[PDB]
């Protein structure tokens, strides 16, 4: 009878494998297996994550082929992957990320070997592309109903765990069903390689190709955006001619939610491209 | 039982179809590979057997695996091109011994030489010094010949064969119309 403060380490490997697995996450029930290494009691690290072939039965203990699982794990052991399995993941599209009776039964059957049994459910179908915040699931002991539910120390991270604060699943099904916090980790190779790779993904090949395209399109295509921009500017000034009457009568309170200022500032920002690229044309013409 | 890896190298030159010797002995030595792989299978089915040639462009025909069902099919389409290649023929397997699954399996590589050697004595003492350095069991099997049987290969084996106690043996087959299976099965390496 002892419990500690565990935290699931999530790198970019399992994240991207859950993003591609989420793209291939058909409404049919899918299967997955997570790997890693156990260094101590209250920490867990995942490194290897792969997918499993779909079946008509779906998420079940019968669909897990022991000769296929042990075969692929042996093929990973003969290679440079000396990590044991740490859990299994899946997707719950539509009906919510909660776990049914079959999922908790195969979880109870699959947790006999690993005491942790990390469970992660990705659902990018109804999740907006703004946030990709994911949550990890855990299994509580049925004999702990008499004592405290979760005697876990370090209650500070619960504020970070309160971000998924849906009012139906967390305390709608919190009985015998809790969760755990999730953190990330990034070394210098992922920071410089992935940062420079993303900056290059938003940059050009030689970085000097598409500059003259806009520098010379300022005289052909942008002129239409400047004339239309002046058409919207006049379309606002026609009301700005009527503004000094009300502003000259009431001067108390604001009724129009439009600011009429930041939009013109943005128009000036779009207009400053000519000024910023004029020096570019000066450098291309000069040398 | 015995935990060791088996690597065989067969010659694909046109010197293996002469009418003076056996009638296309390629099938005879193929049956030799069959009886040594089935013999090692009867002794210990956990042994892996690889297949590769000694041509100019060496190609891994079959990865080290105990399942000979597909190896029997891979024994065909020998692609009889090239004459002989020794340096990358040794380096293509003796350096690839680290890719085996079971690390407890000993290192054992055999080779069927059907063409005269083109390398000088310097390559023989350098490659022999490397093989003796890494301590890999090397069995030399020479099928067919044009010049004298053993002139420099004697010193090649004596300088290559280390650990005289129960070490490696040399297989020298004389000319004759009889089959080579019973002649190469005489030493302790077969069985």
């Amino acid at each position: 009878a002892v419990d500690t403060a565990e935290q699931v380490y999530i790198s970019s490997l399992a994240l991207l494998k859950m993003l591609k697995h989420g793209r291939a996450g058909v409404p049919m029930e899918v299967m997955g297996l997570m790997l890693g290494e156990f260094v101590d009691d209250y920490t867990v690290r995942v490194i290897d994550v792969f997918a499993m072939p779909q079946s008509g039965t779906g998420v079940s203990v019968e669909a897990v082929d022991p000769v296929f699982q042990a075969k692929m794990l042996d093929m990973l052991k003969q290679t440079g992957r000396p990590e044991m399995v740490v859990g299994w993941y899946h997707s719950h599209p539509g009906f919510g990320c909660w776990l049914s009776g079959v999922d908790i039964n195969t979880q109870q059957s699959f947790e006999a070997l690993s005491e942790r049994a990390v469970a992660v459910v990705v659902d990018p179908i109804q999740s907006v592309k703004g946030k990709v915040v994911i949550d990890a699931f855990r299994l509580i002991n049925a004999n702990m109903m008499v004592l405290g539910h979760e005697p876990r120390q370090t209650t500070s991270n619960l504020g970070h765990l309160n971000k998924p604060s849906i009012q139906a699943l967390i305390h709608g099904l919190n009985r015998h069903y809790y969760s755990i916090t999730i953190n990330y980790r990034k070394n210098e190779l992922e920071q410089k390689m992935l940062l420079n790779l993303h900056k290059k993904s938003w940059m050009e090949g030689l970085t000097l190709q598409d500059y003259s395209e806009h520098c010379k399109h300022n005289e052909s295509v942008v002129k239409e955006m400047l004339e239309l921009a002046k058409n919207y500017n006049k379309a606002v000034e026609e009301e700005d001619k009527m503004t000094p009457e009300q502003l000259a009568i009431k001067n108390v309170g604001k009724q129009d939610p439009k600011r009429h200022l930041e939009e013109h500032v943005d128009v000036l920002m779009t207009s400053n491209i000519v000024q910023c690229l004029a020096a570019m044309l000066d450098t291309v013409v000069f040398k | 039982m015995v935990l060791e890896s088996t690597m065989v190298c067969v010659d694909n030159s046109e010197y293996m179809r002469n009418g003076d010797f056996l009638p296309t002995r390629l099938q005879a030595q193929q049956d030799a590979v069959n009886i040594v792989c089935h013999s090692k299978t009867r002794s210990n089915p956990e042994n892996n057997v690889g297949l590769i040639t000694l041509a100019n462009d060496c190609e891994v025909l079959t990865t080290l695996t105990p399942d000979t069902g597909r190896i029997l099919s891979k024994l065909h389409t020998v692609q009889p091109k090239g004459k002989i290649t020794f340096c990358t023929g040794i380096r293509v397997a003796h350096l690839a011994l680290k890719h085996r699954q079971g690390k407890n399996h000993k290192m054992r590589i055999i080779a069927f030489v059907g063409s005269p050697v083109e390398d000088n004595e310097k390559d023989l003492v350098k490659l022999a010094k490397r093989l003796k350095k890494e301590k890999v069991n090397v069995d030399i099997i020479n099928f067919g010949e044009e010049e004298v049987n053993t002139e420099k290969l004697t010193a090649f084996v004596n300088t290559l064969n280390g650990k005289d106690g129960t070490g490696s043996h040399l297989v020298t087959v004389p000319p004759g119309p009889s089959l080579a299976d019973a002649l190469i099965s005489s030493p302790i390496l077969a069985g």
Partner: protein
């Protein structure tokens, strides 16, 4: 805002004028010896005490110089005065013995603090009414340890045993350590009191009693001259599971603070060589405590070399505070160290640079570090250095309490709640012990927000200012009522909001209004 380049010379040249007068003054020699800390400035005043043959005047300077202003300079001046004298002979012996004793202060403090206690049943009854078995169990025992500190009042915990050992978890460790906070300064009743609990088989089923006995023993023998460290090595040598290492490492390092002994360095290194994060964190705290002023050459490079070669975070925070507390008086030395280690890829070590430079620039002697402190507090995207950055700002700007709210008032209501929480700690530490209302009038917007972080830090910051203050001077009814309504309103609040609420209420009732804090 001196740079110490000329202040020490002006002081060491101005301390030659009062000795030539008709009588020497103490305010100048004290106010100078608290800053210069030079051995050549004390050798004369320690030997003139025998020539003057005046016993009453030496007791004050011995009391305050042996009291504070130096730890290693006291560790050297105790043998400097020990060498002088016999290896009025009959009076100088008892003088030199009784001046460096230091236990008389513990006797008088234990005396008036043992006869000035005042307890009320409403507070403890309210804690028993609002106690939970999950989170605030440690808050109740730490508040009871705060209110019963120094008075050794264990009769409150002698009522029943089913309220402390009801759950086998860290709550018993915090209860035993809290008991170590209750009683302090005992050479016999401490070890005897810990041994009398179960002197039957010498095998407790819960090792938290032994770990809390070693950690509590380290809390009792902190900065004492009668340390039992010699027995703590023979007791720490035994192999045990995460209680002799953690509790024994914390207690041993706290008891050996300032000794700079190489023995605790060696056994501490071989205790952290197991790659464990808990004994490496406690070993980091103990190493930081014992290395106060040592500044070993290979220790910093060995710890920073040990930092990036491991994946755990408790080892990085333990070695972070370990290399943070070791930096003291290195104003002219830690420039390239903090400037070089500031651009590290690890956010934990990035916080370790700010916590390390915090205590190094005490006294508001450097206005350049704040450029990168606030520059990394606002510019960096990770909230770790953002909420852990302003603690250095308060540690360097703790001198003026009025100038702090003018620059942290913007951080009171920041963008993210992390800077609001760390800024709440900044207002808690910068105005502690003072009576400035520039933060009190700003505490009202801090205590009302849907985020529990700014509410907890607001209750702690208000609890650090409401202490040692009378009601007739300032109308504290607002924060007293809104802070007292948290324990009755805990049913509709978060689980941690009541934890920080009663934990904040335990600060005012600490010691029964007798003991306070001072920076």
């Amino acid at each position: 805002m001196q740079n110490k380049q000329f202040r020490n010379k002006v002081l060491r040249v101005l301390v030659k004028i009062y000795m030539n007068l008709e009588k020497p003054d103490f305010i100048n020699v004290c106010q100078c010896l608290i800053f210069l800390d030079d051995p050549q400035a004390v050798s004369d005043i320690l030997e003139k005490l025998v020539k003057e043959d005046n016993l009453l005047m030496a007791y004050q300077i011995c009391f305050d110089l042996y009291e504070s202003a130096s730890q290693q300079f006291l560790s050297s001046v105790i043998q400097n005065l020990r060498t002088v004298g016999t290896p009025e002979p009959k009076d100088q012996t008892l003088k030199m013995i009784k001046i460096l004793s230091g236990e008389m202060a513990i006797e008088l403090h234990l005396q008036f603090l043992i006869r000035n206690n005042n307890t009320d049943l409403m507070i403890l009854k309210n804690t028993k009414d609002a106690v939970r078995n999950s989170v605030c169990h440690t808050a109740t025992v730490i508040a009871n340890s705060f209110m019963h500190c120094g008075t050794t009042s264990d009769q409150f915990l002698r009522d029943n045993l089913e309220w402390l050992a009801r759950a086998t978890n860290w709550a018993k460790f915090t209860a035993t350590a809290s008991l170590g906070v209750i009683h302090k300064g005992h050479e016999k009743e401490a070890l005897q009191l810990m041994a009398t609990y179960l002197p039957k088989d010498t095998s407790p089923g819960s090792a938290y009693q032994e770990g809390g006995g070693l950690y509590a023993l380290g809390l009792i023998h902190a900065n004492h001259g009668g340390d039992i460290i010699d027995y703590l090595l023979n007791q720490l040598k035994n192999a045990s599971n995460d209680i002799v290492r953690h509790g024994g490492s914390l207690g041993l390092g706290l008891a050996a603070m300032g000794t700079a002994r190489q023995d605790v360095y060696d056994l501490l290194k071989t205790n952290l060589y197991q790659d464990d994060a808990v004994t490496g964190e406690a070993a980091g705290l103990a190493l930081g405590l014992v290395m106060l002023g040592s500044k070993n050459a290979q220790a910093i490079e060995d710890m920073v070399g040990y930092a990036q070669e491991t994946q755990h975070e408790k080892i990085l925070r333990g070695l972070a505070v370990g290399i943070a507390l070791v930096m003291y008086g290195r104003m002219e030395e830690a420039d390239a160290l903090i400037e070089s280690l500031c651009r590290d890829k690890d956010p934990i070590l990035r916080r370790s640079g700010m916590y390390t430079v915090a205590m190094a620039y005490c006294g508001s002697g450097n206005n350049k570090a704040i450029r990168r402190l606030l520059h990394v507090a606002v510019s960096d995207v990770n909230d770790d250095v953002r909420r852990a950055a302003v603690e250095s700002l308060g540690f360097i700007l703790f001198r003026t309490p009025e100038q702090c709210p003018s620059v942290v008032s913007l951080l009171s209501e920041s963008y993210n709640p992390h800077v609001r929480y760390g800024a709440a700690m900044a207002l808690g530490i910068c105005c502690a012990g003072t009576g400035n209302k520039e933060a009190i009038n700003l505490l009202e917007p801090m205590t009302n927000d849907p985020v529990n972080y700014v509410r907890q830090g607001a209750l702690i910051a208000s609890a650090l200012i409401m202490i040692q203050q009378t009601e007739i001077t300032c109308p504290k009814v607002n924060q007293f009522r809104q802070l007292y309504s948290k324990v009755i309103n805990d049913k509709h609040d978060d689980v941690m909001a009541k934890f920080g609420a009663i934990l904040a209420q335990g600060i005012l009732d600490a010691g029964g209004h007798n003991v306070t804090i001072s920076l």
